[model samples]
Target chain A: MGLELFLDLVSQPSRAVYIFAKKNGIPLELRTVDLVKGQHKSKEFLQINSLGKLPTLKDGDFILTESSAILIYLSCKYQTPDHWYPSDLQARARVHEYLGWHADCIRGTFGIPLWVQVLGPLIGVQVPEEKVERNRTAMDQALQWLEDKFLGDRPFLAGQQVTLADLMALEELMQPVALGYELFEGRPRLAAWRGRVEAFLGAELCQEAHSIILSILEQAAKKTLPTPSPEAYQAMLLRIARIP
Target chain B: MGLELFLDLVSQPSRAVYIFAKKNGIPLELRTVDLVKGQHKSKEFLQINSLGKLPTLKDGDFILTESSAILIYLSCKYQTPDHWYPSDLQARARVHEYLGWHADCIRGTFGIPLWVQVLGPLIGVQVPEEKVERNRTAMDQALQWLEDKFLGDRPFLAGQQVTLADLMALEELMQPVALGYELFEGRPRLAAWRGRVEAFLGAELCQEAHSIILSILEQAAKKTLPTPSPEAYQAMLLRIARIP
Candidate 1:
């Protein structure tokens, strides 16, 4: 009947979309798609998004997928702050540039820790130590690039003010952090950048957005989480195999 | 003093940018970054794009990297056709949705063939047959999703009109095809979609965009192509190692 956002906060990109919407005060019906229960694959959900990916936006009759696209759509439709997407040609290009790099480089690298450390065990698939080590090395390289090429004395990723670039990137970086990989601990600049982004996002909202992923290890350890269905395991295995 | 684009035709995204600019009659100086020679790592090129990735754009004092970003920037700054990046909210969201999916699902999978067949041997590294087979399977899955979810009954990827989504996808699909994979032969629907996109892009520009990659195998076989520098080989090795 109205704007509805389907999301699972455990997903990095989902958190990104959720945080942006909440921060910008864009009113919408939040539809929780519990990925742990394989709700996304239900026939009804599939009709909304054939791909069954999280963070899908249904605005009246039109539907949209992809977190970055959703953010851009919301920014444009609501005419959100300029710092969120920027209007100047060059400044806007910078936002797109960070997004492109984040999608290609950071997204995959950052999410590996969850797969290797947490999700793999849940599905009885053990990622080899070699693969885990390889992912760590890749994450290190990407973090360096993130700092040197992207942050580089700037208060935010795309510019002086926080933008969607910062929102997307911080959420992704948090994935590894939640998985017990302290990516920002050793890097002073990156750590500082994280503080700035978190402060801007505010502590309460940040906690609410990240609570699921941050507690994943505890839930897994206690065996409180239900065993994923056969289909969910299969789907997760496919995702794990895709990590390179 | 004018717009400058640094690209290599061998890369799929580079070809996409090249075609978009040419089709729009966007006046820009084409600066060929000889990727084979590791020229992207040169000090001058690094000054333009520290990431050392191809398809970088420079307009006046502004510098932009990432092909999708460049395409969007050009579409906005030059006021290119709405079909290139539709102005309608729903249609434009569709374009962004496709681009996001293409980046995460299609881009890495599509580019693997070149590394396995052509680029691997160039640097004295042979991608294992297992990895090669894995890539083929991944490509098949991605292609299926591309047709079923994105293309559907539409003449182009996003909707009735050709957009940057189609351009980006066509170039990536052509990569495996040029490597002798012939991915489009079996799927009539996909093949027809390719034909329509190519026809819209036109034969002359298509030929111009694809010439370098189409002849890559021949040049690689004859060893006439300059051997990439040690740094280039190392970089390529890292990329190939990244294949999941």
Candidate 2:
């Protein structure tokens, strides 16, 4: 394989990588490692990534995980486009800055809604109502920082053209929406920015990339998601247990 | 006006930036934003970084926060030694890989002891003993990945030479030790890696960078740290309430 990207669109970071590679026309093999089904926690998957993370990239002998690292690595490796990851020193730092914040504020906070709604019950757990409300407040706080501190009046998160930060952000911001949460409503700036980003990525591609995530609620209603095997159930139970 | 880095030694990531700058001979003014004092949340400080994150870097008109961003920016901006960040594609990805894992597992987990042991009480909120014990296990889990998955018998985290990954891991790992956690007692691999990293950074410089953190327990015992102002108190309590 010229390049192999292990991804499952259900995972936010994986979608970031999937969209980036496909959008840029970077030639790579997409190897699906499903998350909702817990393929990522499988023994075989652990051999590929001892850490058992998705969005892993394999280029010959080298293997890489972590969407941020994979994105930057691909950006520099392919020289995809300056807008994707600027060469200008400050612009690069701006992307890096958002990446760090994405880790701190975005990832954990946004993913909680999905965990509370679907994943929690998949493993026979009900996150308390108080905890659920706290998670909601956390989202608001993250959103405040997302709009005020990072985006401000800039067209893109890092400024001007779309960059890796925008991709990372767009996928994560979609998580809550997929779970039937009102994400873009009541937020004019964020709404407009999402409109701009999707237009750039093109509506067809955006739909293709996001269909699985957008269908999460419907799938839950249909009870189509697989009941976890013992390993996956224990894994999910551990995950939900840590969700406080 | 050379580079100006905003930092506070109390925070682990700030120490990473401090040691990286001095170790690489980069000249910059160090503006202290005392974290424990809640000075980072101060209005005046918010003017500098509205997000109010630690380990910010100021380069002329540009202000960059997030310790990971600052370290990477400094490494590239000053053209530091290749060993610090590495120009080789694979070596660089190794650093990035470690960085992403560090963000996910290292940052939140390692800082818990300090929060539970000292910071919580200062705000009159005690993290439950069960949370404390769970936090300790989290540290253990992080340490396992630190050695087995990342280090894996390598001399340094990224590779044979000290890289930004080592700096980030060292400081965050130090947080627990500073709070009287048995970090290096049984983990020969981890302890040796720490020894190698400190030796490369040199004893005096390491001590100088670490003095403030090492004295945390003493300062905590003597109750010398200023009680948070009401705003700081609420901010800290918000932080503590989320600690479970």
Candidate 3:
């Protein structure tokens, strides 16, 4: 058995894993543990990753959780070029800095639209409009910091080279974009940065990795994705409740 | 100029950085940019770190932000004990995994009590009891996951030795404790882990690092703390709004 990654592209981190692995040609089996249908409830997957969170990786008997850790391990094990994780102490530290801020400000705030636009209605519930606005404001605030502080004049998030920071950030930012809440509407710097990231990762692979989310609204509307089973609604509720 | 750290122990991440730096003898000046009186509003600090978030480090010309980043760069720079970051690949990977999960679930969940109990009332407002309970429940849920998913059978968060994972988590959970929530009360395993962390960190150093926060409630009550001016009220409200 080789490296196996359990993923649902519905997750931003899972999408990061997919794109990074595909781009680097790290041979691994992709296991789909769908989030909505609660396929993650499967005893096998859950037994390994009891939390059922995505971007989980299994290497022989060693299992890993957390997308950043997965990406770092993959970078090290396969030696997938220092550009992704960086080698210069300052450069890697900058990436780590971006990652910590990314987790706190961007990662959590940017994902609100999916819950409000897709998953909330998928389970026959509605997140409050005021709550929606609050999250939107939060994203906008974080984006300004991102543009001025992190992005600055750099072509990528961490630095001149495309990195895991860009890989993870692009996926997180796109979640709202998929729901027609275009974050890049007026932020020309961020828009240009996105272009650079996409160009580095290439268009086809980016689109292929992103198409699931890019079409999520349509799929949810057409009932192509099953409404979550009642058993999973509590989990969904608990997730959305974090939008604060 | 030597490295200077902008910090206020009121925030958990700042405390972690302080403890980590002090323990490792990182040799940095502590610059107080108090969170409450909106001392972060100082153009001197804000210009260097425009966002005014804690764990900001200034070393000569380079400015660093984010607590995790500060800890990482400091660890590498000072060549801190391998026990903190770990030299073993597998163990370090475990630390990275715990840090990510710790950021998402515990960091936000544990900090709400301060807003409800101290800052909320400090500004002459009341957080809704229902929402308070909602977040309280959220914290409890996260605690369960912390115990079972990450901390299971490990003497420390990453392994038998303390790492950045344990350092970050102890400070975050300590926020509620300072506010008098006592998260460790019902969880025997978590309490033992706490004992280990405190013992390893040394009781006096731990007490020295935590004394500011431990006295925050009383300080706020005695009005030894300056109330936010109108200029600072928006910033204060903005921080509290994030407790959602």
Candidate 4:
């Protein structure tokens, strides 16, 4: 009867939800819907989220899917801190702007490492180096805009405090880093911004939530993850056909 | 400088901003940023939005980008009708939920017609028939989910009353229709929803704003509109590359 959250740490949005809930002290049951083994397709998970995606929030009879939505809802419902989503007119609008851009500009580009390096090979497919380069180029473009448009001379993405923008953007940038690509190496502004965010989030909390991704490359080095099922393979193929 | 909105009527999000401002009787200066001829990339347009995208709002000093952000800002600043963005926690969360999904599910899927039929050819690239089929499949899937998840026997997207979601969605679907695709051929529910949106948004206002797009498509068929210059072509290529 209490609030329940379905999540898997390997998923970026899931991690965002986990961090938000944990940091804000919103208590919930964590239901792991693993993607690597295709646990999301299971019947129980389907009951939780018909779309078979995470993270999903269940509160009594009300159900919500989409991490951004869940985060905003939790922030409002639980009356968590304001800096996470900010209440000021312009501050909130800025957060919304970042979310919009984060979706349209950031999602596909950053999630590629998992697919290209791990998921693709697991499924008996290999993405071309040219395609990988193209993906990197896209990420670089987004990073440029992130620095210029959002983070220019600011301590955080929206303003002085770490907003939902920082939570979401950092998780995305960390994707490339998980694949041995340190995207934040030479960007001092982004590096400092990340430091500030981590400092506010506390090093211990950041490490706990990011352990899975930080250890991903090592795990990938040791052994391979399971391949996609036929259905998931078809989905991947369709995504590639349409997206790039 | 009172208030200025740089927008293109053909683009769906721009239409959302247009409808919101007009419906609420918010006074503003409309600066048309023609998307077809690469007007969004002009020096003047960049002065307003360095990102070179439409639906940019400029008040006395504060400048804002992204359609959903603009809509939320208008809802708060102008104190529009309560139903548009309900103040109650649950109702407002529903609006936020719909907007979050709108960004994730709708923004990228609905605007591909131009890339498929016109922009691809104009820029010496082709999306191939197979990719086009895949795009159609993706759109169909999203449309089905939209109906099931959001509509679900409701009159509007969020609930019984028309909200920002209805305007944002209707305008995006209108893009393909403008480019010679009849998306509402057999979907009765969607068709009726469209009528409800049109009714909520007065016919004259819709006509006044949408006339630019309807007429431009006509002129495009005749190849009467001036072509973008080489510089504009590069900027547009960047824009397309930036598009998810």
Candidate 5:
């Protein structure tokens, strides 16, 4: 009924969806899919998204997965400010370009911290030191590209106004940060860009969206969260195998 | 200067851009970047795309990289058939959804064959048998998701009509096929879908776009193609490392 967003804030893409929906003021049911508990694998959720991925949007019978698509759909359906997606041909293409690069370069590299630091140990899989070093190198390379190619002295990723590019990119970059790796500490340009994005999105909203990930390590250390079942471990292993 | 697209047909995404531009009758100059010769690393090309990636688009001063972005830009600018990108909200979202999934699931998996059989040998770096076996399993898993989650019963990936999703996906799928692995041989549904896409795109254009990749092995055997330089090998090694 109406619109429902099945999400878990622990996921970078899911956080992107949540931020976009809240920032745009689009009303939708926040359907929590506890990824750690393997709720995403449930029959009902699988019927909505057979892939068992988070951040699925249901508009009546039309179900949509993939955060970028869901964000674009919301932008179009709600007719939000043009800046979120842009109207100018080249400007819009720039947003798409950033997104494509983000998927290739940023998504996998930035999300590695969680798996390397927390998830892997929980599942009794220790990612080798060699793999961790390689991931760090990958992260550095990606950050350089993010600053040089995409950010490049711009106020926002795409241009003057903040677009979906900033939303998606910032969430991903924050993943490593939440895991206690200050990725933005040395890079002044990237650090400033993060501040600008946070200011634009407002601190309150950012905290609300990021709180789960921010506290992930503490929760794991405190043993407050339930131990992930074997099914969840299997699912996480498959995901970790995808860290390109 | 009008629009100019710098592409290497051997790359799957480049073929997608080439085919998209050709099919829509968009008048643009084609600047071939010989990837094997390390031409993409040349100073001139780096000025255009610092990342040294294929399928860079230039419209006067506006330089665009990434194939999906280029395809979308061309679609919008040229006002090609609506079915290709769709103006309707849900249909367009489906196209975006498919593209997102394609970027995550298909791109890396389908392109691995080239590295294992061709580029790896060229660079004198052997991808381990374990990695190769893992890549095959990844490919099979992605192909299953492509058919079940994305294609379903639809004639095209996005929906009933051929869209950018179909063009992008078919080219990636063709990469392994050209490398002597007929991925579609046992998958009747995928095979039929390929037929439909090729039929829609027409045989002549398909041949023109796929010619280079199709003949890669023959050219490599004949020793007619320039041996990739050490720099090219180094660059390729970096790419290979990213493969999960």
Candidate 6:
């Protein structure tokens, strides 16, 4: 009947969309797509997002997917702050550049532990120790590039103010942190950047939104996440084996 | 002192920027950044785009990188046709949606060939045939999603009119095709979509722009591409091996 956002907050990008909408005060009906339960594959959800991805936006009769795109669309249509998606040519490209890099470096790499440590085991899957080590190495390498190329002397990811880049990036790195990886514990620079973004977005909201991920490992240890069906289990195991 | 675009048509995203600027009657001073020659890493180019990537745009004092971002910035700054990035909220989100998927599905997968068949040999780093096959498999899978998920029954990627998403997508698919993969030879729907994007972009310009990449395998086989220094070769090898 109104604006509907189909989301699964367990997803990094989905969390990005959720955080953006909540912070900006965009009104919408929230439709939770329970990825753990394979709700995304249901016939009903397919009508909203053909690809079966989360954080899909249904405004009036039109529907759109892809969290980065949805976030950008919401920013433009709602006319959010300039710093979110800057009007300056270079500053805006900075946001896009980070998104591009995040898609490449962060998305695939950050979510590995959730599979290796918790999800895989819950679903009766076991990834090789070498594979887990490879993921760890990948995370470290991405952090190096994050520091050297992106965050280098900037107060925020792009520059002086909090932007979509920071939000997108923070949500992604939070994945590792949520999986019980102390990714930020050793890196003061990254930690400071996190504090800046959290402060900008309000410390409480950050904690509120992140509590799910931060507590995910405990839930997994206690065996609280929904277990996968046999068919889903096989598919997810194949996905784990293929990760580099 | 007009717009200067640092580009190498051999790069898929660069070709998209080239076509978009030319088709829209946007005046640009083209500066070729030779990929084979490793000129992108040169100090001068770094001053332009610190990321040292091709398809960097310099608009007066402002310089920016990333093709989708560049395309959007140009569309907004020049006020190009609405179809390029529709002002209508729904249509615009569709454009962003396709671009986001393109970055995730096509961008890295399509570029693997240049590494496998050409760049790898130049540096005396040969990926195993199994690894090469694995890359090809990844491309085929993404191509499947490209058709089934996005293209579906739509005349264009997003809708009726040809958008920048189509241009960016066609250019990436061309990378493997240029290496003699013949990806579009049998798929009529995808091939027809390719023709439409090229027709809208101007056939002659598309051919001229793609000529370098189309002949890349030949150029590579003949050992015509410039060789990086040993240090550069080692760095390049590290980059390629890191690809998943």
The local distance difference test score of each candidate is 0.88, 0.85, 0.86, 0.80, 0.89, 0.81
**What range of 10 consecutive residues in model 4 chain B has the weakest lDDT sum?**
B235-244
TM-score attained by model 1: 0.98
Residues A1-244, candidate 3: write the lDDT tens digits: 5889999988999999889999999898998888888777667778988887887999988899889999988888888988889878789989999898898888878888888988888877799898899999888888888887889987887999999999998899989988898889889999999988898889889879989988889998898987675547778888787666
Summing lDDT over every window of 10 consecutive residues in candidate 6 chain B, give the lowest-scoring window: B229-238
Positional deviation of A26 in candidate 4, in angstroms?
1.3
What value does the lDDT take at residue A167 in candidate 2? 94
Tens-place lDDT digits, model 2, residues B26-111: 99799998788878888988888886768788888789988888888888988999888888888888898889888988888788
Task: Look at candidate 5 and tell me the lDDT of residue A103.
Answer: 88
Q: Give the poorly placed runs of model 1, Cα more than 4 Å off.
A: none
**Backbone clash count, each prediction separately:** 0, 0, 1, 0, 0, 0
Q: Looking at model 2 chain B, report the run of 10 residues with the lowest lDDT sum.
A: B235-244
Candidate 4 Cα errors over 4 Å, as ranges: A227-231, B239-244
- In model 1, how large is the Cα lDDT of residue A27? 93
**Which DockQ-derived CAPRI band holds candidate 1?**
high
Residue pairs with clashing backbones, model 4: none
| lDDT tens digits by residue: candidate 6, A190-243 | 888888888889977787778877787888878788876564565576567456
Q: Candidate 3: where are CA atoms >4 Å away?
A: B229-231
Reference-based lDDT, residue A163, model 5 = 94
Cα lDDT tens digits, model 1, B1-244, are: 5899999999899999999999999888999999987888877888888888998998887888999899999999889989889988888888988998889988888988888877888877889788888889889888889887788887778899889999999999999999899888778779999999898889999988999998988998989778887778878889988887
Backbone steric clashes in candidate 1, count? 0
Q: What's the CA error at residue B188 for candidate 6, in Å?
A: 1.8
DockQ: the better of candidates 2 and 6: 2
- For residues A19-40, could you state the per-residue lDDT of candidate 2 as single tens digits? 9988999998989987878788
Isolated chain A TM-score, each model: 0.97, 0.96, 0.97, 0.94, 0.97, 0.95
DockQ (model 2, Cα): 0.79
